[PDB]
PDB file of C-alpha atoms and ligand atoms in Angstrom:
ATOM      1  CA  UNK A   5       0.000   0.000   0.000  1.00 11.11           C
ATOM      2  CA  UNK A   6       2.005   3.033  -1.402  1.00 10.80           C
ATOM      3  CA  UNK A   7      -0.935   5.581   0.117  1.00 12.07           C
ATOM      4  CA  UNK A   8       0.030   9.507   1.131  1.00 11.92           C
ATOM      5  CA  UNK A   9       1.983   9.348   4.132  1.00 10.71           C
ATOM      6  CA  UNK A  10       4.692  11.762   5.615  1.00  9.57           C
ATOM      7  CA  UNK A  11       8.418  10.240   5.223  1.00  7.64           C
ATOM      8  CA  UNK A  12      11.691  11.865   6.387  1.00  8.24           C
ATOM      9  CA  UNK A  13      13.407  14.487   4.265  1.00  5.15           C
ATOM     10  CA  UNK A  14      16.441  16.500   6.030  1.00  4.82           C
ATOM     11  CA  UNK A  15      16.767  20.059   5.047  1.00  7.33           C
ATOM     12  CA  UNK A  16      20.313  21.656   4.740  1.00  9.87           C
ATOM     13  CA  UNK A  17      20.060  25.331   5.210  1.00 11.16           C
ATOM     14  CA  UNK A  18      23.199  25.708   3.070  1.00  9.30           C
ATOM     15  CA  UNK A  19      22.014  23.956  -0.117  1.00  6.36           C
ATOM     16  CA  UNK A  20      18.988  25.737  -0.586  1.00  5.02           C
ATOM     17  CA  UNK A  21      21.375  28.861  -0.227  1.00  3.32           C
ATOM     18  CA  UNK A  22      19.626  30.116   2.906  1.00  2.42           C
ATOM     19  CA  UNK A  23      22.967  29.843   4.857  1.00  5.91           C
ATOM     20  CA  UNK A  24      23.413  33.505   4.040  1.00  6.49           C
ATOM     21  CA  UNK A  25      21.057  34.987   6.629  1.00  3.88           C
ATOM     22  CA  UNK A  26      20.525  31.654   8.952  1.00  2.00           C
ATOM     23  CA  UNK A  27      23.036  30.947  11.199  1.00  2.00           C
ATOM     24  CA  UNK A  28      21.362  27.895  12.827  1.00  5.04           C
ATOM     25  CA  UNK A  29      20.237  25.419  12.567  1.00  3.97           C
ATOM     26  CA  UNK A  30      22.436  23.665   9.601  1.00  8.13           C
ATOM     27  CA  UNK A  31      19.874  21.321   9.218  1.00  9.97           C
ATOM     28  CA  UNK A  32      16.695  20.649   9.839  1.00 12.19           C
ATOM     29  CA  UNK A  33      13.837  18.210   9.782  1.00 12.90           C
ATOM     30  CA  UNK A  34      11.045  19.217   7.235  1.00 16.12           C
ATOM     31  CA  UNK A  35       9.499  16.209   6.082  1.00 17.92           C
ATOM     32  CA  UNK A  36       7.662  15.580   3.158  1.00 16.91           C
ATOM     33  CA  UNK A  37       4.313  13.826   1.845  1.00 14.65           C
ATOM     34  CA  UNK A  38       4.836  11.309  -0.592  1.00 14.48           C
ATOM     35  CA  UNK A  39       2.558   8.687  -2.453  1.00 12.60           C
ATOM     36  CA  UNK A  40      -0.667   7.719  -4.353  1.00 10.98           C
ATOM     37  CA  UNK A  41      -3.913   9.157  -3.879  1.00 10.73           C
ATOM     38  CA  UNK A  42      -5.729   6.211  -5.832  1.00 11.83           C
ATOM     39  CA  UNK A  43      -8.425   3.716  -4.572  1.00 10.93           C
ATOM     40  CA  UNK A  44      -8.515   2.210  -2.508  1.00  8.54           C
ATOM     41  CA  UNK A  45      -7.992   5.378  -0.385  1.00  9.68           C
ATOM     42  CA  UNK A  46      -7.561   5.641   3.354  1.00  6.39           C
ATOM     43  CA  UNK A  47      -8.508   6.686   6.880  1.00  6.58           C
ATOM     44  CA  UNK A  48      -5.790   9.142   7.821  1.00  2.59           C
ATOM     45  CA  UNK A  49      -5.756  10.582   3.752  1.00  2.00           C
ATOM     46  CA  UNK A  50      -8.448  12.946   5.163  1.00  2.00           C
ATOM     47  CA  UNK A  51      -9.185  13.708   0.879  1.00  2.00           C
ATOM     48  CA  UNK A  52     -11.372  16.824   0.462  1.00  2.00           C
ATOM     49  CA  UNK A  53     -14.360  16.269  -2.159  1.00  2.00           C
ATOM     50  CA  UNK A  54     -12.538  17.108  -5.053  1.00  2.00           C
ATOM     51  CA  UNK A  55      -9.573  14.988  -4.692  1.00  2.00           C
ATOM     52  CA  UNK A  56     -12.063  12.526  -4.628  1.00  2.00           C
ATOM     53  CA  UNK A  57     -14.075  13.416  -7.763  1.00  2.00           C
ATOM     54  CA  UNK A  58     -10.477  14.823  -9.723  1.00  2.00           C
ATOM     55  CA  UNK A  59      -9.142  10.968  -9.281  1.00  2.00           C
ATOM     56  CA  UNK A  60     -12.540   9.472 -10.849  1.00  2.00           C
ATOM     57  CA  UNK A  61     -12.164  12.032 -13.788  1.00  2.00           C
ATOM     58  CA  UNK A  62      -8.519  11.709 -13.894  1.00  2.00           C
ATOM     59  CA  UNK A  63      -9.397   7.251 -14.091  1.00  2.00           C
ATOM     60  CA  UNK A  64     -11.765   7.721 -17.192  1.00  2.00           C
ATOM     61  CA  UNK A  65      -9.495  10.534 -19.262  1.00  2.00           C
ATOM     62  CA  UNK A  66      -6.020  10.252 -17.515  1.00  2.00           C
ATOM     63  CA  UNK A  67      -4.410  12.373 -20.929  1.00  2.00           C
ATOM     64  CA  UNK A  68      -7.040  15.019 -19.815  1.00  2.00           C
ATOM     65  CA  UNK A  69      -6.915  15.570 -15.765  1.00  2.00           C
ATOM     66  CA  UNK A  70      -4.395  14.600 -13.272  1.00  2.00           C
ATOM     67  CA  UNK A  71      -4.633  13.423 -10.217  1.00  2.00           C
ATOM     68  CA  UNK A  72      -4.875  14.107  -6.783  1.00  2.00           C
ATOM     69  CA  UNK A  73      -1.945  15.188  -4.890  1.00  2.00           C
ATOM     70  CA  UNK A  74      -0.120  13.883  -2.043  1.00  2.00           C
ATOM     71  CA  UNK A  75       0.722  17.542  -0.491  1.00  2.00           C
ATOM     72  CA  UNK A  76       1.267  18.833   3.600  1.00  2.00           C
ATOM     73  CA  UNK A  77      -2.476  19.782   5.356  1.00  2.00           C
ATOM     74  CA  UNK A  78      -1.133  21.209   8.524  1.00  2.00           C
ATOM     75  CA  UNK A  79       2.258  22.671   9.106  1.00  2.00           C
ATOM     76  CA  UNK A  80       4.041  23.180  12.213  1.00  2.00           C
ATOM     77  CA  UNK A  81       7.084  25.958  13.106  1.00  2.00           C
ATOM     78  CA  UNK A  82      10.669  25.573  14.229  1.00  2.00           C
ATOM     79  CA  UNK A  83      13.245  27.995  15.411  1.00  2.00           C
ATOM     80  CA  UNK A  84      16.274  29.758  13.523  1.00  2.00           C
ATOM     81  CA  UNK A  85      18.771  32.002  14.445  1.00  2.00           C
ATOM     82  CA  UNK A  86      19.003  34.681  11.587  1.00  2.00           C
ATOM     83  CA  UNK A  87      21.269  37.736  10.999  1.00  2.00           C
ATOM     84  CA  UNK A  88      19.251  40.937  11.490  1.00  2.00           C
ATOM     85  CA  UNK A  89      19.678  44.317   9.413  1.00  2.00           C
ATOM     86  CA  UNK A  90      22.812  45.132  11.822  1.00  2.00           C
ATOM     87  CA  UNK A  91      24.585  41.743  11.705  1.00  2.00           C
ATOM     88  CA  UNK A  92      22.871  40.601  15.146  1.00  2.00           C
ATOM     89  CA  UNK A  93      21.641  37.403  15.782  1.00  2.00           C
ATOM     90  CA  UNK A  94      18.719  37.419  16.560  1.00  2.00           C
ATOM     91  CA  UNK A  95      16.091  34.030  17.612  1.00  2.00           C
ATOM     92  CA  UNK A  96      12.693  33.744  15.534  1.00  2.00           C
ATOM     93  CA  UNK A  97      11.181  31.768  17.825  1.00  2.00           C
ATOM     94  CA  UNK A  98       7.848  30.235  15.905  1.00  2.83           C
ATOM     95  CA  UNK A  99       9.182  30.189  11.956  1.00  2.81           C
ATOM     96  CA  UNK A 100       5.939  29.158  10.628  1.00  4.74           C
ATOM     97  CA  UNK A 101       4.971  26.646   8.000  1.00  7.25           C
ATOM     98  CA  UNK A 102       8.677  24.687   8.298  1.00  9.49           C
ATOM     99  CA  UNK A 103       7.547  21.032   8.975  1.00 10.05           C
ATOM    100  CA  UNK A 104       5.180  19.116   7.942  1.00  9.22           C
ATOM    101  CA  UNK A 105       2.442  18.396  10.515  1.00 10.63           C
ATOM    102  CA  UNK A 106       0.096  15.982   8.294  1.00 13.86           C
ATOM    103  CA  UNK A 107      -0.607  14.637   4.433  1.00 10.26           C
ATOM    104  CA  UNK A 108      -3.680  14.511   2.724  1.00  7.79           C
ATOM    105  CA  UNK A 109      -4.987  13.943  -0.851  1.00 12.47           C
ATOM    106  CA  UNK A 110      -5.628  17.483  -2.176  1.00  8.76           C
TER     107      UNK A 110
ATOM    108  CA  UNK B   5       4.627  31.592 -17.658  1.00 10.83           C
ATOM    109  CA  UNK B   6       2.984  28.323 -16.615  1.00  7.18           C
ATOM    110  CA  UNK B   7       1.729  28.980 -13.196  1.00  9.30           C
ATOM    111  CA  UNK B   8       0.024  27.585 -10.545  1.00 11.44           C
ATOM    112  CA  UNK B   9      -4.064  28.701 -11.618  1.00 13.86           C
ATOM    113  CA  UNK B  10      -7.264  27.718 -11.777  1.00 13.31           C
ATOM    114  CA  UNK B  11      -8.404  26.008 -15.091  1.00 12.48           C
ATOM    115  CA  UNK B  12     -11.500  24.804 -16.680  1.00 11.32           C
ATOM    116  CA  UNK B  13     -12.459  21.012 -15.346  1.00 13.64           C
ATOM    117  CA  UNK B  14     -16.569  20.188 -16.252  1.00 16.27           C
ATOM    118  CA  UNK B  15     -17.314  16.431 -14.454  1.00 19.25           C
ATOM    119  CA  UNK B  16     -20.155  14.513 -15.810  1.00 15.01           C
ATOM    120  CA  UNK B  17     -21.699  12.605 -12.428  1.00 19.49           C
ATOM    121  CA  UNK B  18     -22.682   9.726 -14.695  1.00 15.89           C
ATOM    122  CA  UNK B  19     -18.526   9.093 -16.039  1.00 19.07           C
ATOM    123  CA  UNK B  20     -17.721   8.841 -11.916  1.00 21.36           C
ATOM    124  CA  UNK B  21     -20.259   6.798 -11.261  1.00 23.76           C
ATOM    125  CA  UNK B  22     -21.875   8.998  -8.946  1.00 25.78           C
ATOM    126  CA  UNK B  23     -25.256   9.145 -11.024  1.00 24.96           C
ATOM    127  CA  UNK B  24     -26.833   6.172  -8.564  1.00 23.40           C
ATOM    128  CA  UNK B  25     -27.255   8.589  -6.008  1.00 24.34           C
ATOM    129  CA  UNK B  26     -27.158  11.699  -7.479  1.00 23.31           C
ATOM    130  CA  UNK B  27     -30.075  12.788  -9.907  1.00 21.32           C
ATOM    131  CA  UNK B  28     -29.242  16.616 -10.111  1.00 18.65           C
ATOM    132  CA  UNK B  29     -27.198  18.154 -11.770  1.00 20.69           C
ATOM    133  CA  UNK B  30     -25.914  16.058 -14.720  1.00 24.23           C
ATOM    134  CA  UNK B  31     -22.955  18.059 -14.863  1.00 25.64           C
ATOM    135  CA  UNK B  32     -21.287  20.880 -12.493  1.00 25.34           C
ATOM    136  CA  UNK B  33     -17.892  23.111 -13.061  1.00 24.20           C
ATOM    137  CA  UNK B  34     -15.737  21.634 -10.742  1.00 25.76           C
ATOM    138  CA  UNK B  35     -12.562  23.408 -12.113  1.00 26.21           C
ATOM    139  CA  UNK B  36      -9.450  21.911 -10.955  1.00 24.34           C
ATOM    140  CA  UNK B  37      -5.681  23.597 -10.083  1.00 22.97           C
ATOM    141  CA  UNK B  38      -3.091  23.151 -12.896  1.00 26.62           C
ATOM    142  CA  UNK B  39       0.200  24.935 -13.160  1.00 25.80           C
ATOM    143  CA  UNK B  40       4.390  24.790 -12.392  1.00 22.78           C
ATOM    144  CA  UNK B  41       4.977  25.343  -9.040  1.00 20.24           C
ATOM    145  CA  UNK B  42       8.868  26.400 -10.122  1.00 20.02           C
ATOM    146  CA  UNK B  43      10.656  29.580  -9.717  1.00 19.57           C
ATOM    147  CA  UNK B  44      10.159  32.365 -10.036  1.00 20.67           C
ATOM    148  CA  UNK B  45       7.171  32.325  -8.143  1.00 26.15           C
ATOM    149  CA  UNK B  46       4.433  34.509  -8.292  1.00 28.24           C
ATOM    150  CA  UNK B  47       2.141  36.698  -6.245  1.00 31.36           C
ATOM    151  CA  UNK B  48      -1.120  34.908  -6.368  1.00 32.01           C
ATOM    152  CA  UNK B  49       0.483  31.176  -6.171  1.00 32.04           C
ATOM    153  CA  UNK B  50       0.790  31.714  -2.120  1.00 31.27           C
ATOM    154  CA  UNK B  51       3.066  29.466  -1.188  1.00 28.50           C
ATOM    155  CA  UNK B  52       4.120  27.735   2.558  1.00 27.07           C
ATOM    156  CA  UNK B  53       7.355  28.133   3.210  1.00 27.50           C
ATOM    157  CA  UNK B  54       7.231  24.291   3.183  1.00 26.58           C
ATOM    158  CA  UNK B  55       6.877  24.255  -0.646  1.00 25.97           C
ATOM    159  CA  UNK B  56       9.292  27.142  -1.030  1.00 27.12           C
ATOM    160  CA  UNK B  57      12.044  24.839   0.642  1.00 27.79           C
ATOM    161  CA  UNK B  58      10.967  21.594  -0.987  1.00 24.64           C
ATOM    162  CA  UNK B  59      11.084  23.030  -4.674  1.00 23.71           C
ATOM    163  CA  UNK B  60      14.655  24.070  -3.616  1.00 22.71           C
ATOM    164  CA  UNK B  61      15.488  20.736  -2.440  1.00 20.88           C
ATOM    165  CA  UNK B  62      14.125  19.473  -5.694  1.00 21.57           C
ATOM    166  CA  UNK B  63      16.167  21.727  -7.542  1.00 21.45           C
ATOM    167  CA  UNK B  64      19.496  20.473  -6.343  1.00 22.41           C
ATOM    168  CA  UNK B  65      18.095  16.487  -5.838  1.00 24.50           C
ATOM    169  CA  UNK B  66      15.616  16.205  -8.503  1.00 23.41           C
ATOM    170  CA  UNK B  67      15.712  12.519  -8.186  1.00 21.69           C
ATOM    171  CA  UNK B  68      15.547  12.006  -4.614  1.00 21.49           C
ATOM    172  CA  UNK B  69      12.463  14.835  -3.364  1.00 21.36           C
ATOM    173  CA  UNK B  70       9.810  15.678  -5.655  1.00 24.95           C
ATOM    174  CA  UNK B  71       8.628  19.214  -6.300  1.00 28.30           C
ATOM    175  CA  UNK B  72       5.845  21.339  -4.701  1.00 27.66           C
ATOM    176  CA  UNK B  73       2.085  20.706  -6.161  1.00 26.83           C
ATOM    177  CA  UNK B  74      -0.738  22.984  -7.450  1.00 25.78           C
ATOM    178  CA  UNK B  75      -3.101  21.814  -5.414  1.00 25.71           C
ATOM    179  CA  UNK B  76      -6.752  23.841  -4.606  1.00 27.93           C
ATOM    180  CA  UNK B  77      -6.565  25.638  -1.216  1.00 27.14           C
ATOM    181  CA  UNK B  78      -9.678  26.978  -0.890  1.00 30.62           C
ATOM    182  CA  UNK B  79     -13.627  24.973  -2.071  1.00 28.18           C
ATOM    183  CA  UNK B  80     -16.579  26.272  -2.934  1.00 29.40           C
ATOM    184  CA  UNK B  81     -20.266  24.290  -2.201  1.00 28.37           C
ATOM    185  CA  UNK B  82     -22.465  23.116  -4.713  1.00 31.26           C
ATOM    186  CA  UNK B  83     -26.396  21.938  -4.072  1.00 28.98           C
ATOM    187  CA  UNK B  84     -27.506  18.391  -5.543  1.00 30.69           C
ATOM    188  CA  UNK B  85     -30.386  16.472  -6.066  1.00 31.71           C
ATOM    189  CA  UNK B  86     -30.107  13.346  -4.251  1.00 28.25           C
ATOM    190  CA  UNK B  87     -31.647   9.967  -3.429  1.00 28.23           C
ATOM    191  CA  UNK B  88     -33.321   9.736   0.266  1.00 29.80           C
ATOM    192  CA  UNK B  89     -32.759   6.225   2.294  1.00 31.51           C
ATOM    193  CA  UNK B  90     -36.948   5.546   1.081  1.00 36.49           C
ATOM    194  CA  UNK B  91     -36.138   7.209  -2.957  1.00 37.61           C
ATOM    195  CA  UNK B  92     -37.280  11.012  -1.742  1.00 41.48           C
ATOM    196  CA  UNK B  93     -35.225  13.482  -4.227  1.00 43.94           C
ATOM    197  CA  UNK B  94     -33.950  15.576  -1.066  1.00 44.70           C
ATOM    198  CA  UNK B  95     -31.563  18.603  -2.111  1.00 44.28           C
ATOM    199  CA  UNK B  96     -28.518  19.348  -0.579  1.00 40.83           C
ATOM    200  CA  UNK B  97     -28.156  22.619  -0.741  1.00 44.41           C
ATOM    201  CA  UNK B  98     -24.454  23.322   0.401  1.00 45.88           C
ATOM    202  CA  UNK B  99     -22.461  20.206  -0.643  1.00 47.74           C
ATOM    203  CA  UNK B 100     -19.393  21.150   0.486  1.00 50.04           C
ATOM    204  CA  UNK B 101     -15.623  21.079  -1.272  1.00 50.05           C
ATOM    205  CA  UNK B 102     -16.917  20.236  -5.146  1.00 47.66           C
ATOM    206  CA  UNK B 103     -15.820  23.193  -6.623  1.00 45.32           C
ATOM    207  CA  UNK B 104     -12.106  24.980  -6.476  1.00 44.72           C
ATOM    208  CA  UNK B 105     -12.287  28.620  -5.402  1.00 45.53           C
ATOM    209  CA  UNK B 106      -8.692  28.975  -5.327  1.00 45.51           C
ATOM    210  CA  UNK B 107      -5.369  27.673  -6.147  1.00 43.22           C
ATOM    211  CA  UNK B 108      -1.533  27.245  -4.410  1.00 43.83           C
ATOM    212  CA  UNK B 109       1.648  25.392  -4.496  1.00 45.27           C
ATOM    213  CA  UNK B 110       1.107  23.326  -1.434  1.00 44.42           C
TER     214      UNK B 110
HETATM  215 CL1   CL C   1      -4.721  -1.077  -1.386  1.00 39.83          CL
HETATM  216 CL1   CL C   2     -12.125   4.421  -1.167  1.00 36.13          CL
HETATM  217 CL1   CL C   3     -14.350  18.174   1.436  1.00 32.03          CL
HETATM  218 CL1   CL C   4     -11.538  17.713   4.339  1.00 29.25          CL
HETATM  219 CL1   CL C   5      -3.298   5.994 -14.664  1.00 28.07          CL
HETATM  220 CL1   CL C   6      -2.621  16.269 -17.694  1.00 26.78          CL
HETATM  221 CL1   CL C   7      -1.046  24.694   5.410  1.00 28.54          CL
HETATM  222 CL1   CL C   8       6.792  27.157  23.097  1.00 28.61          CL
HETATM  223 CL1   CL C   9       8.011  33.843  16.988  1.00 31.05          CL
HETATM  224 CL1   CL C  10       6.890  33.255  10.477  1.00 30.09          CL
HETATM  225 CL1   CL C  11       8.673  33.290 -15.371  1.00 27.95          CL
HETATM  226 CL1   CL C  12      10.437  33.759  -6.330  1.00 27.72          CL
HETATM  227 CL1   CL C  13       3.921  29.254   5.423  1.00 26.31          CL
HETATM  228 CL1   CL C  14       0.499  30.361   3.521  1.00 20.89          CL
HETATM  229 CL1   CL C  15      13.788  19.300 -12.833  1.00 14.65          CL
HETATM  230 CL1   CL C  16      10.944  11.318  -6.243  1.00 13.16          CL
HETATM  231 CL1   CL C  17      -9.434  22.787   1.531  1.00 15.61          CL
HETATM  232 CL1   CL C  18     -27.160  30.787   0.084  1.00 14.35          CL
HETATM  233 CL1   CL C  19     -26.645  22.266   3.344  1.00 14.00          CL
HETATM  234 CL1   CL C  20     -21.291  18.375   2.904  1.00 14.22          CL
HETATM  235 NA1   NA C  21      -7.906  10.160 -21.995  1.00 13.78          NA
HETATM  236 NA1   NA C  22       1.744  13.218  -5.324  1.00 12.72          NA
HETATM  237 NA1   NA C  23       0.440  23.291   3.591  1.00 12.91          NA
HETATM  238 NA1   NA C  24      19.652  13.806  -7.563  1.00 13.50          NA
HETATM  239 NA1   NA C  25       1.297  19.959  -9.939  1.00 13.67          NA
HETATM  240 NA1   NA C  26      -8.446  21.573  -0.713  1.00 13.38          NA
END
């Protein structure tokens, strides 16, 4: 059962070329949401009504439509130290929207 | 520019199999999200910093993380005609997430 699901993905600040205003963490975990939205779906897929009906259409005309999409439905925040305007560092607390939280067909 | 937007998506209740239950309308515009969720972004596409940092990711791993998706973030209601439990045609007037109001890279 290859269903949407949240699997590991580490984030280095430095190849994304954000190492120029964080100065920590190096790395972080961000997660990501990967696999099928096809039926059978799930329990914890959570799909809205149109990821629903967009699979059906996308079964019957798949050159037409796409699919659903295995994408993050709640986010949470972690905490970087960044360089502010006068080269201080300087804690954000709650960076929002950073990790992934939970998956859902979308 | 092919961005993350809203496009044209008309579903036919009978092709999804949904016509057993369903005996109004025959058809609804359901629309569906459709678009590159590459840079540069733009204004409208509103992403999460989540998808901001996975595209990157992508960028430099292409094989290893996938990209971000244009997926709809906000649904609009539509009302149908359907079956009761004892064959009444009872309307449900706000049927919610059938129809995309708007779209994001997710
Ligand atoms: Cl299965
Ligand atoms: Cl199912
Ligand atoms: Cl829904
Ligand atoms: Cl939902
Ligand atoms: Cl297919
Ligand atoms: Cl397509
Ligand atoms: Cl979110
Ligand atoms: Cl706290
Ligand atoms: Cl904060
Ligand atoms: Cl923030
Ligand atoms: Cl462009
Ligand atoms: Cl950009
Ligand atoms: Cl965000
Ligand atoms: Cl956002
Ligand atoms: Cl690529
Ligand atoms: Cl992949
Ligand atoms: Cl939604
Ligand atoms: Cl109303
Ligand atoms: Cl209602
Ligand atoms: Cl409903
Ligand atoms: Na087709
Ligand atoms: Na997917
Ligand atoms: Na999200
Ligand atoms: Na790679
Ligand atoms: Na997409
Ligand atoms: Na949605």
């Amino acid at each position: 059962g290859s269903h949407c699901q949240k699997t590991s993905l580490r984030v280095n600040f430095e190849d994304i070329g954000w190492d120029s205003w964080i100065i920590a963490p190096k790395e972080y975990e961000a997660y990501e949401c990967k696999g099928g939205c096809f039926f059978p779906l799930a329990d914890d897929v959570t799909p809205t009504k149109h990821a629903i009906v967009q699979t059906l259409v996308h079964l019957k005309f798949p050159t037409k439509v796409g699919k659903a999409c295995c994408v993050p439905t709640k986010l949470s925040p972690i905490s970087v130290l960044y360089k502010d305007d006068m080269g201080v560092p300087t804690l954000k607390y709650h960076y929002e929207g950073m990790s992934v939280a939970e998956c859902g067909c979308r």
